[PDB]
Write a protein that binds this DNA or RNA. Structure first.
Ligand SMILES: NCCC[C@H](N)CC(=O)NCCC[C@H](N)CC(=O)NCCC[C@H](N)CC(=O)N[C@@H]1[C@H](O)[C@@H](OC(N)=O)[C@@H](CO)O[C@H]1NC1=N[C@@H]2C(=O)NC[C@@H](O)[C@H]2N1
Lengths: 52, 88, 104, 63, 117
RNA sequence: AGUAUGGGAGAGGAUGGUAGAAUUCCAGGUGUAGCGGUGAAAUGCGUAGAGAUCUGGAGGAAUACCGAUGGCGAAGGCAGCCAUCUGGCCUAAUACUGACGCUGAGGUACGAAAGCAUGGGGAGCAAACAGGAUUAGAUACCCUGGUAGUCCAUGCCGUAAACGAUGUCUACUAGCCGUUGGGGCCUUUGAGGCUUUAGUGGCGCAGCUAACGCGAUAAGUAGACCGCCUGGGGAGUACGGUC
């Protein structure tokens, strides 16, 4: 998963902007790590908010 | 860092037969090249102890291979250390 | 030569001037050597949070291949150009040429 | 949160809904966590105990 | 003297005290009341009843400017964050939204040491 | 035991840059009697305009969520993001060398926190210290402040319940259930199900143990080498020596 796919990125973000754990999403661990990296990159690039 | 071309050139220079990669001459030549290359890195990063451990391991492995080669054949050992410019 | 992906955020006031800068950087990369593998303009987009009291930005994506020195020169240019407010440089394996999701 | 109010909703349902959203978010737990400094030793001990409890709960609900 | 229609109510709720500040939009204060301002000095400043009294006093004070609708922002833990909203609704403003704005560090400064009570 | 070539996972290490949240201080706007703190208070701050709220600056330190009997490292330890330099590990099949191995007295390298030296930095926290409480007393626990230090550069010190209170290497000895990184196979289309390998956990047959317990990650069955113990105090002390 790449940081540009904000449509998939928002699926794993709570309302206030936090990352949703794999405990809830059922995501596999490697995918979860890639997803967290993509979310942080998008936050830096201002495609998605850090909070709210 | 050395590239595949550099390593292949060293292997071709020091090989003792066709497809020979495990001979003491080839192994010691590769180790010497790597050890000499890393000296530039440890000049800039004096406090990279975690990486310096690997260099110490390379030095120890080279010493063991040299001692084995000297035990097996003194002429090949002399020729190899002369070619590589090593004190011992 | 290594492969790099560059994302540039340019001030909306320089939305017209973005074109000159892009050809400038492309020409510099080509003079060094290199190959531009992908170039995309995402246009003007709304920021998720204000940057320097600005709510809009012009987005540029480049996929380039270059040596070390040219990467340093590009980094210096991005640092000292006031039009660019944010940049992201990511080293990549292979080369990417497909149409991005965000460009549309 | 940002619990906007419908015209039909009274203040009491507003408060209950906003309280539920705050429980979902968990801000108050964060505030109580950062009220005082917790040392790394105690933090690791607490997390290890939590892991043991989680595994035992999983085993109990499995059988 | 000044007239505004929309408002905001900031409820600073804390384990020791609750402060209600009714402000216009863009945050210029219009009315404010705390528990100590109505009494309950010392340990009693933190009760929901004191929070409610402070909230009603602030709302009645702001009615002189005259506001119909307000957004409520709550900050902090502690008793009275719900009670104050209850009192404002009882006074009769219409609450547009209620959002929690308690600040959270992303591992910023080091907290004080633990109390050995 | 080692080498060459393809592929893979990682808070492994060093250098530089950068991002957002929060605390503190400063300057303005609106605004007016309290705020703060506790078991309860008082010290303290406030009409010289505090606290609360909005805006704009300065600076330092640390990286919420992800996050996990998860991962990496010889151990000590390692957590935002990006680039540069760099170590080791896993995995497949060929090819290559041909015992090149294991352990290791002396020796040498690394080695948490506190501490020391020279020069910077200093938000928050906080030994010492000052005041307020509690107390028969309080030299403490609690509260209000607060210097060294915590931070950076370059060196020293060499100690911790530095712990798995369990030295390193090798082979063998029922099974069942998880989890991380890979390989292969099978259905059949997207996801599952079998095996194997290197880690990391929970039970448990045999065996072992004074017992507790350990039980393929042994404290079982054996082999190689090293370190250490010989009743409790005196005492890791005195003297001599090295640093
Ligand atoms: N090959 C290389 C691999 C290296 C790696 N290291 C893996 C490894 O090799 N491990 C070896 C296993 C040794 C084992 N650790 C010894 C042990 O477990 N107890 C020591 C003897 C104590 C006594 N005989 C039994 C006991 O009192 N038990 C308690 C008890 O059951 C329960 O406590 C309470 N309150 O009832 C539980 C939860 O609190 O804690 C246990 N106690 C503990 N649990 C902890 C734990 O596992 N570790 C660290 C430490 O914290 C441990 N103490």
């Amino acid at each position: 998963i790449d940081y540009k796919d904000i449509d998939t990125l928002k699926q794993y973000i709570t309302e206030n902007g936090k990352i949703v754990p794999s405990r809830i999403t059922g995501t596999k661990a490697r995918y979860q790590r890639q997803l967290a990296l993509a979310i942080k990159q998008a936050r830096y690039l201002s495609l998605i908010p850090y909070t709210d | 860092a050395l590239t595949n071309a550099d390593r292949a050139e060293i292997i071709a220079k020091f090989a003792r037969a066709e497809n020979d990669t495990g001979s003491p001459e080839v192994q010691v030549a590769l180790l010497t090249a790597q050890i000499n290359d890393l000296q530039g890195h440890f000049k800039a990063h004096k406090h990279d102890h975690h990486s310096r451990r690997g260099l110490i391991r390379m030095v120890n492995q080279r010493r063991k291979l040299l001692d084995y080669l000297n035990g097996k054949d003194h002429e090949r050992y002399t020729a190899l250390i002369g070619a590589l410019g090593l004190r011992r | 030569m290594r492969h790099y992906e560059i994302v540039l955020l340019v001030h909306p006031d320089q939305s017209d001037q973005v074109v000159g800068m892009v050809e400038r950087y492309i020409s510099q990369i080509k003079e060094a050597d290199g190959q531009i593998h992908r170039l995309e303009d995402w246009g003007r987009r709304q920021l998720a949070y204000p940057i320097n009291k600005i709510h809009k930005a012009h987005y540029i994506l480049m996929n380039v291949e270059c040596g070390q020195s040219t990467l340093d020169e590009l980094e210096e240019l991005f640092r000292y150009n006031d039009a660019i407010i944010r940049n992201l440089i990511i080293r990549r394996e292979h080369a990417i040429t497909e149409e991005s999701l965000l460009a549309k | 949160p940002q619990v906007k109010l419908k015209e039909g909703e009274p203040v009491d349902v507003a408060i209950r809904r906003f309280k539920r959203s705050c429980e979902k978010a968990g801000v108050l737990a964060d505030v109580r966590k950062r009220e005082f400094y917790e040392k790394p030793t105690q933090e690791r001990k607490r997390k290890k105990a939590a892991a043991v409890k989680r595994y035992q709960k999983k085993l109990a609900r499995e059988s | 003297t000044r007239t505004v229609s929309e408002g905001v109510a900031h409820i600073h709720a804390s384990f020791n005290n609750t402060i209600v500040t009714i402000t216009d939009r863009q945050g210029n204060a219009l009315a404010w009341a705390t528990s100590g301002g109505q009494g309950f000095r010392g340990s009693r400043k933190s009760t929901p009843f004191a929070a409610q009294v402070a909230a009603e006093v602030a709302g009645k004070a702001a009615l002189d400017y005259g506001l119909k609708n307000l957004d409520v922002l709550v900050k902090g833990p502690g008793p009275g964050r719900e009670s104050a909203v209850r009192a404002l609704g009882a006074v009769g403003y219409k609450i547009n939204s209620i959002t929690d704005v308690t600040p959270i560090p992303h591992n910023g400064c080091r907290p004080p040491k633990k109390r050995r009570v």
